[PDB]
Amino acid sequence: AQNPNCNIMIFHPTKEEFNDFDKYIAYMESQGAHRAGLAKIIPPKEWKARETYDNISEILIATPLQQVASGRAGVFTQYHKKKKAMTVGEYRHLANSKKYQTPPHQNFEDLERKYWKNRIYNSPIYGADISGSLFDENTKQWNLGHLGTIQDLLEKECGVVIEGVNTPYLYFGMWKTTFAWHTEDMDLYSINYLHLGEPKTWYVVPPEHGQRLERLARELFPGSSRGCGAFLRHKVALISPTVLKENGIPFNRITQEAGEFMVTFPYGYHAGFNHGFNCAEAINFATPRWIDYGKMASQCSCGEARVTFSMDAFVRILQPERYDLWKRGQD
Ligand SMILES: O=C(O)CNC(=O)C(=O)O
Numbered sequence: 047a048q049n050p051n052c053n054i055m056i057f058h059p060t061k062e063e064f065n066d067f068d069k070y071i072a073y074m075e076s077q078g079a080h081r082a083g084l085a086k087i088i089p090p091k092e093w094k095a096r097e098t099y100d101n102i103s104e105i106l107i108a109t110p111l112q113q114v115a116s117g118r119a120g121v122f123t124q125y126h127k128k129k130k131a132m133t134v135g136e137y138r139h140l141a142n143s144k145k146y147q148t149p150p151h152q153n154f155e156d157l158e159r160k161y162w163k164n165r166i167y168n169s170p171i172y173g174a175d176i177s178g179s180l181f182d183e184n185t186k187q188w189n190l191g192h193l194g195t196i197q198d199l200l201e202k203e204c205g206v207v208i209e210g211v212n213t214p215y216l217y218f219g220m221w222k223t224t225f226a227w228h229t230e231d232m233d234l235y236s237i238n239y240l241h242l243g244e245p246k247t248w249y250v251v252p253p254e255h256g257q258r259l260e261r262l263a264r265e266l267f268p269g270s271s272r273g274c275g276a277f278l279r280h281k282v283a284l285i286s287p288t289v290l291k292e293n294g295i296p297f298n299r300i301t302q303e304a305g306e307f308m309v310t311f312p313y314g315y316h317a318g319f320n321h322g323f324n325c326a327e328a329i330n331f332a333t334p335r336w337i338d339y340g341k342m343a344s345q346c347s348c349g350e351a352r353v354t355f356s357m358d359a360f361v362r363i364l365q366p367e368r369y370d371l372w373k374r375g376q377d
Pocket residue numbers: 217224225236237238310316326328329
């Protein structure tokens with residue numbers, strides 16, 4: 047069995063290997079990359095996402111989200127308070143202000159220590175989940191707006207044509223902005239490109255160990271667990287690496303820098319934080335290997351998770367027994 051320790055693997059495809067996206071995902075899986083839940087892909091040196099980032103300041107962040115924490119430094123939840131709209135140029139100025147800027151630090155490990163010590167005492171503002179793309183239309187390789195759609199994959203594998211669309215999302219971050227422990231909708235893959243700015247630190251649990259994380263989360267967030275049998279779908283809970291290690295949960299960590307892709311694999315729980323002002327683009331995708339994970343994905347039906355239009359068909363076709371309850375939670 048390849049990669050039996052479930053380490054995060056880093057790949058360096060050549061320009062020739064960068065042509066066929068599906069083929070390269072299958073290659074990484076042949077080497078056991080999915081066992082980690084997360085992989086890094088460094089693009090060939092010849093490649094670029096677009097010519098420059100000099101003209102992005104007028105993008106609008108319609109609903110910036112202030113991420114307010116509750117709990118203790120290593121075990122906390124966050125809620126999102128909506129703020130007034132602002133442009134990317136306004137948000138970048140805010141991120142660089144004395145109130146929000148990255149503190150002085152020695153290295154990524156020092157900054158990580160400072161994040162876990164101090165995150166809860168601040169409320170950073172995240173420009174998340176903005177429909178759009180920063181890839182040039184002329185970029186033919188690993189262009190996250192030009193991927194095969196998940197609806198087309200389901201149709202190819204299973205023979206059933208479904209409604210829905212699959213487009214990318216932009217994320218504008220600042221120091222301490224945080225992504226809570228989660229798997230993707232329907233336990234899909236994700237791909238994330240860090241277009242510019244400061245790094246993103248990731249934590250990940252191997253897919254084969256995801257239920258260990260879920261059992262710890264039920265213990266640590268006992269009211270939330272009574273409220274919902276899949277409350278990690280709410281995307282609000284944080285658990286630090288120190289707490290994971292104290293409780294014997296297998297995990298790994300890695301820092302993504304500008305110009306690098308990350309792929310999350312089906313049922314790979316992940317969480318993390320941004321180092322400073324940055325912009326990322328991410329989208330969900332599927333492969334044949336995903337179908338069995340889609341069929342078994344948990345679902346929130348309490349009303350909290352609320353998701354896109356396109357998830358309806360995935361539930362309806364892959365999980366018909368669950369459909370009626372889940373749809374009630376959507377309405
Ligand atoms: O970058 C972020 O805030 C969150 N991204 C992801 O969870 C992802 O790409 O799957």
